[PDB]
Paper text:
Here, we report a general and rapid method for discovering α-helically constrained (Helicon) polypeptides that cooperatively induce the interaction between two target proteins without relying on previously known binders or an intrinsic affinity between the proteins. We show that Helicons are capable of binding every major class of E3 ubiquitin ligases, which are of great biological and therapeutic interest but remain largely intractable to targeting by small molecules. In addition to possessing increased stability and membrane permeability, Helicons are capable of binding large, flat protein surfaces that are inaccessible to targeting by small molecules, and Helicons have been developed to target a range of PPI targets in cells and in vivo. Characterizing Helicon-E3 co-structures and mechanisms of action, we identified new binding sites for α-helices on the E3 surfaces, as well as potential probes of the disease-linked E3, WWP123,24, highlighting the generality of our approach against this therapeutically important target class.
First, we focused on the NEDD4-like E3 ligases, which make up approximately a third of the HECT family. These include WWP1 and WWP2, which each consist of four tandem WW domains and a catalytic HECT domain at the C-terminus that transfers ubiquitin from a bound E2 first to itself and subsequently to the target substrate. Group 2 Helicons, the pan-HECT group including C73, bind both HECT domains, while Group 3 Helicons, the WWP2-HECT group including C72, bind only the WWP2 HECT domain (WWP2HECT). We next solved the crystal structures of five Helicons, four in complex with WWP2HECT representing all three groups of HECT-binding clusters, and one from Group 1 with WWP1HECT. These structures revealed three distinct Helicon binding sites on WWP2HECT. In all of the structures, we found that the HECT domains adopted similarly closed (inhibited) conformations. The WWP2 proteins in the co-structures with H301, H305, and H308 share a low root-mean-square deviation (RMSD = 0.5–0.8 Å) and are shown overlaid. Group 3 Helicon H305 binds a similar location near the interface of the N- and C-lobes of WWP2HECT, with binding residues predominantly in contact with the C-lobe. Consistent with their ability to impact the catalytic activity of WWP2HECT, H301 binds near the E2 interface, while H305 and H308 may restrict the conformational change involved in activating this domain. We found that individual Helicons from all three HECT-binding Groups (1–3) could modestly inhibit the auto-ubiquitylation activity of the isolated WWP2HECT.
Author numbering:
A (entry chain A): 492 to 662, 670 to 865
B (entry chain C): 2 to 17
The structure:
């Protein structure tokens, strides 16, 4: 049970202890970037991708192979999302909740394209460089073989989350119809699922099955193919010690956070800017290392990534939704977040050295 | 060797 700090050099050592000498050349034109890099890497052997990376990007003055590489990661991480590849989509407006497009099958060769990205992420992490694709946190849980919780459902599909909340909070068969490009199929949630009816005792089991299905619907093989290519280069077992939020910070890297811009673009409900709690809140957020501030930002928004322009342009489901605090819950409770709303529920805590504790615990030991 | 650990630590010190 060590710190994120320890987990990096023990993981970063784990990469180096398998790094190969020499180098590997990658000749690409920024026009044919995708189709070059794809045909490049997929025709290559996996572990050659641990050698020094030389990215020959045809028509160059560049010689700082560090800059072209880091540049290449940024540019390719964006370009894989190109909708003419039919690979990804977003559940909400304004590019919210990046998820696999279940119609990738339209490309009979798509599974390889996903395998490729697995190889690519592994390269990006094995060579300790950063990207800007903007994956969901549940994505990382699947990479960690963690099951995603109901809180995750709140983040990605509010109406679907708020549906099941009703079922658990009141009192069907084990199937789920799914329209795949017109044609619809009835997925048996279990064996004989079409015949078995929902009971109060079966609901406990039943609710889980949906929670898992919502994530693993029509993306079961795209995921299985993706994970194979990543495993082919770097074992997922290497990430056994990490969690969802630690992992995202590895792939995107840490930034300094504009502490001013945060306070200047934070909106409140029930609370006001000159409340005891908030004037304490920014007290705690100041005597804080950058490591936690992102972890906090991760806790509330569901992503360490900042979109263009700062906290002002912060997006949730249903459109822009700036950083928001609310006087919610009992002060015998922890403060909890609503990442679809980019909203923090903060109880009226009667002491500074109580808020400080209660806050950090929510960030540390909850999601 | 152990120079690997003596380079992993430097990778964390730098990156984070
Ligand atoms: C053997 C050894 O400790 N090398 C080493 C590791 C880490 C750092 N710190 C940074 O690079 C910031 C220096 C030297």
């Amino acid at each position: 049970d060590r710190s994120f700090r320890w987990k990096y050099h023990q993981f970063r050592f784990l990469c180096h202890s398998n790094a190969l000498p020499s180098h590997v050349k990658i000749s690409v034109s920024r026009q044919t970037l995708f189709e070059d890099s794809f045909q490049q890497i997929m025709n290559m052997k996996p572990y050659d991708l641990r050698r020094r990376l030389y990215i020959i990007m045809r028509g160059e003055e560049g010689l700082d192979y560090g800059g072209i590489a880091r540049e290449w990661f940024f540019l390719l991480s964006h370009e894989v999302l190109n909708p003419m590849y039919c690979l990804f989509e977003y559940a909400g407006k304004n590019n919210y909740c990046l998820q696999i497009n279940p119609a990738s099958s339209i490309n009979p060769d798509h599974l390889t394209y996903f395998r490729f990205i697995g190889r690519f992420i592994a390269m990006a992490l094995y060579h300790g460089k950063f990207i800007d694709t903007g994956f969901t946190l549940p994505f990382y849980k699947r990479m960690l073989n963690k099951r995603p919780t109901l809180k995750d459902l709140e983040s990605i599909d509010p109406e679907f989350y708020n549906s099941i909340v009703w079922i658990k909070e009141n009192n069907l068969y084990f199937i789920q119809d799914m329209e795949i490009l017109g044609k619809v199929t009835t997925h048996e949630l279990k064996e004989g699922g079409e015949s078995i009816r929902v009971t109060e005792e079966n609901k406990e089991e039943y609710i889980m099955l949906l929670t898992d299905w919502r994530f693993t619907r029509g993306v079961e093989e795209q995921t299985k193919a993706f994970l194979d290519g990543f495993n082919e280069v770097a074992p997922l077992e290497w990430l056994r010690y990490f969690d969802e939020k630690e992992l995202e910070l590895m792939l995107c890297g840490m930034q300094e956070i504009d502490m001013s811009d945060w306070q200047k673009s934070t909106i409140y409900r029930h609370y006001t800017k000159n409340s005891k709690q908030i004037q304490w809140f920014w007290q705690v957020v100041k005597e804080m290392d950058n490591e936690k501030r992102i972890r906090l930002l991760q806790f509330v928004t569901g992503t360490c990534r900042l979109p263009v322009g700062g906290f002002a342009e912060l997006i949730g489901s249903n459109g822009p939704q700036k950083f928001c605090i609310d006087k919610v819950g009992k002060e015998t409770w922890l403060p909890r977040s609503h990442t679809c709303f980019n909203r923090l529920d903060l109880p009226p805590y009667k002491s500074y050295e109580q808020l400080r504790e209660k806050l950090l615990y929510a960030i540390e030991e909850t999601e | 060797p152990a120079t690997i650990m003596c380079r992993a630590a430097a990778d964390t010190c730098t990156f984070f």
